[PDB]
């Protein structure tokens, strides 16, 4: 009963608004600064064009050929190798406790951008320190716009290990956002349009500003010898395998609802070069940003922001000021990350829950279950997030962005997506189903993409961050505690160690001597509906 799209157009507008979103706009600059400004691109590109469309297109094309969800897809690929659409559920869920917190913030943010005068822009307020100093007049002391970043929307803990309290009004709007997630679960055509016009009138900005000369050499210059750190590469290639909202189970779910004969092919190389350039160009704006901060403020460009989880949120509200009218500008660029955010939740969800009613459908999708179900899953999801929504709780998010849904967990996962699909089940073999449904024998590209290239980066990536191990900070000067690294690493073990676990039940199940069992396992059932 897999009901197909209306037309090819709602595919695609799914698609296209759900793997943008905060990962173009929030965490690759975030991740670009906090790493090399240029050494960056590097492995970002490598993966993009070794590991991350043709794993996309695998995801996308599995889904269209079983007609099936994220965990039901690998029952008709491979038996034993189930667990990881089990494994790409537990990552999604991780995704939608701490994603839709950021959304919270820009909330926050739209209810501070009605006032007068932006509160951002001049110090002297109730929550500024005394250090805090205007940015003109800098020719220590701290920018305006990073102390109400940290000490009015934060209002940050020294510590992970001190959570303080509650804050009561960012609970408030993480809370607002979870009920419009529900309710729109339970124009697109704008939503899709205005954020990109948004994001032009941004770039317009950035570029305009004086001293953004040194930001974009800053962004496109890159340090050979970063790359002898494996940071920059796990994280280039982690916010590949995220932008693309890969190993998560919400793209074979996308694209289950596609039509058998579908040309998958085109559409998937066009949405992934749009992200990748919306990506790439919000760079620009975010670093030409930075490098008009580092000018005014007499300071290096790799010291005028957070490295962390709040770039986006320190450039950006720096550079709206700027413009004329500075509080219709903020109004316009909140809304425009709540709809990209919102977008990307939906889908998210949405793919979650529909694995999820396909693992039992006779009582999770009979047609009352089901609104109860989303119920449940938001309210759980809600008070898991509370967590960061505490004044100590950005540290809990840091590690929730660097573990959970992010880092060696989609290592795991995107090689054993690609080594059942490319040694086990065939690459030949899946060639002929996707020749079958897109109607041409695609290039060897996406064969020789999963077969070599993509395993080879995921574990030359795990073996050499696990070799020169590096412990977690947040702005490169806090020290997690042991308790707190141990935590991270149990959110990625939660669901790194879905694909064994699984892999044991399935053989302790078949009955048999175990090569019969891992024979008639391995086999199968049935490729296409
Ligand atoms: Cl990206
Ligand atoms: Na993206």
Same mark, same amino acid.
């Given at each position: 009963?897999?009901?197909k799209?209306?037309?090819k157009?709602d595919?695609?507008l /799914? ?8 990962? $173009? ?5 975030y991740?670009?600064?906090?790493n090399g400004?240029?050494?960056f691109? #590097?492995?970002?590109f490598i993966?993009l064009?070794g590991?991350?469309l043709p794993?996309? @297109?695998? &995801?996308?094309?599995?889904?269209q050929?079983?007609?099936?969800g994220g965990?039901?897809?690998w029952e008709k690929?491979?038996?034993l190798?189930?667990g990881?659409?089990?494994? /790409?559920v ?6 939608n ?10 909330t ?16 002297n307020?109730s ?5 805090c ?7 220590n002391?701290?920018?305006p716009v990073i &102390?109400f970043?940290?000490?009015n ?7 992970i ?7 009561w009004?960012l ?11 529900? @309710?729109? #679960?339970?124009? =697109?055509?704008?939503?899709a ?10 770039? =317009? ?6 001293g953004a000369?040194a930001?974009?050499?800053f962004?496109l ?6 790359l002898e750190?494996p940071?920059?590469?796990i994280?280039?290639?982690?916010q590949?395998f995220?932008s ?6 919400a793209?074979?779910? !996308?694209?289950?609802? $596609?039509?058998?004969?579908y $040309?998958?092919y085109?559409?998937?190389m ?6 990748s ?11 030409s940003?930075?490098?008009?901060m580092?000018?005014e403020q007499g300071?290096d ?10 770039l986006?949120?320190?450039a ?9 009218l500075?509080?219709?500008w903020?109004?316009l660029f ?11 939740? @939906? =889908?998210?969800? &949405? %793919? ?5 009613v396909?693992?039992?459908?006779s ?6 279950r089901?609104?109860?179900f989303?119920?449940?899953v938001?309210?759980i999801?809600?008070l898991?997030?509370?967590?960061m929504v ?7 998010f840091q590690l929730?962005?660097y573990?959970?849904?992010? +880092?060696?967990? !989609?290592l ?6 690609? @080594?059942?699909?490319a040694w086990?089940? %065939?690459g030949?073999?899946?060639?002929? +189903? ?14 020789y ?6 395993? =080879?980066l ?7 961050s !696990?070799?020169k191990?590096?412990?977690?900070t ?5 020290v ?9 690493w149990?959110?990625?073990?939660? /669901?790194?160690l ?5 892999i044991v ?12 069992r891992?024979?008639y396992?391995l ?7």
């Amino acid at each position: 009963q897999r009901e197909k799209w209306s037309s090819k157009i709602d595919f695609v507008l /799914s698609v296209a608004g759900g793997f943008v979103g905060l990962g $173009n706009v929030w965490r690759f600059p975030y991740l670009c600064y906090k790493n090399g400004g240029g050494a960056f691109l #590097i492995p970002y590109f490598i993966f993009l064009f070794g590991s991350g469309l043709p794993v996309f @297109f695998l &995801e996308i094309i599995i889904g269209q050929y079983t007609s099936e969800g994220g965990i039901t897809c690998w029952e008709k690929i491979c038996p034993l190798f189930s667990g990881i659409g089990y494994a /790409s559920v537990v990552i999604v869920s991780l995704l939608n406790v701490y994603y839709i917190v950021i959304l919270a913030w820009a909330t926050y943010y739209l209810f501070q951008s009605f006032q007068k005068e932006l509160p951002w822009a001049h110090c002297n307020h109730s929550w500024n320190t005394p250090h805090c100093m205007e940015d003109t007049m800098r020719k220590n002391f701290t920018s305006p716009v990073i &102390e109400f970043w940290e000490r009015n929307v934060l209002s940050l803990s020294p510590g992970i290990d001190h959570p303080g309290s509650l804050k009561w009004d960012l609970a408030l709007c993480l809370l607002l956002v979870w009920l419009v997630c529900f @309710f729109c #679960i339970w124009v =697109v055509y704008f939503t899709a349009t205005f954020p990109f016009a948004m994001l032009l009138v941004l770039l =317009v900005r950035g570029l305009t500003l004086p001293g953004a000369g040194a930001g974009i050499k800053f962004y496109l210059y890159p340090d050979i010898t970063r790359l002898e750190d494996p940071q920059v590469w796990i994280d280039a290639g982690t916010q590949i395998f995220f932008s693309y909202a890969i190993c998560l189970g919400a793209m074979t779910s !996308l694209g289950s609802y $596609n039509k058998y004969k579908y $040309n998958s092919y085109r559409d998937c190389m066009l949405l992934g070069c749009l992200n990748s350039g919306t990506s790439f160009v919000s760079g620009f704006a975010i670093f030409s940003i930075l490098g008009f901060m580092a000018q005014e403020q007499g300071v290096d460009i790799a010291d005028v922001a957070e490295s962390g989880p709040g770039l986006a949120f320190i450039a950006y509200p720096k550079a709206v000021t700027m413009m004329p009218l500075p509080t219709f500008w903020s109004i316009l660029f909140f809304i425009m990350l709540l709809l990209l955010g919102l977008d990307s939740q @939906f =889908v998210e969800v &949405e %793919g979650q829950i529909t694995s999820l009613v396909d693992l039992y459908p006779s009582f999770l999708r009979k047609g009352y279950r089901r609104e109860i179900f989303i119920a449940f899953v938001c309210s759980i999801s809600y008070l898991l997030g509370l967590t960061m929504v505490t004044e100590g709780g950005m540290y809990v998010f840091q590690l929730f962005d660097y573990y959970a849904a992010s +880092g060696v967990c !989609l290592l795991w996962v995107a090689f054993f997506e690609c @080594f059942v699909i490319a040694w086990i089940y %065939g690459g030949d073999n899946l060639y002929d +189903g996707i020749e079958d449904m897109i109607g041409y024998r695609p290039g060897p590209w996406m064969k020789y993409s999963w077969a070599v290239i993509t395993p =080879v980066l995921c574990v030359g990536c795990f073996i050499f961050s !696990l070799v020169k191990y590096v412990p977690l900070t947040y702005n490169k000067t806090y020290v997690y505690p042991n308790w707190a690294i141990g935590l991270g690493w149990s959110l990625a073990l939660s /669901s790194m160690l879905c694909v064994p676990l699984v892999i044991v039940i399935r053989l302790c199940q078949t009955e048999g001597p175990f090569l019969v069992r891992v024979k008639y396992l391995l086999t199968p059932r049935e490729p296409n509906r």
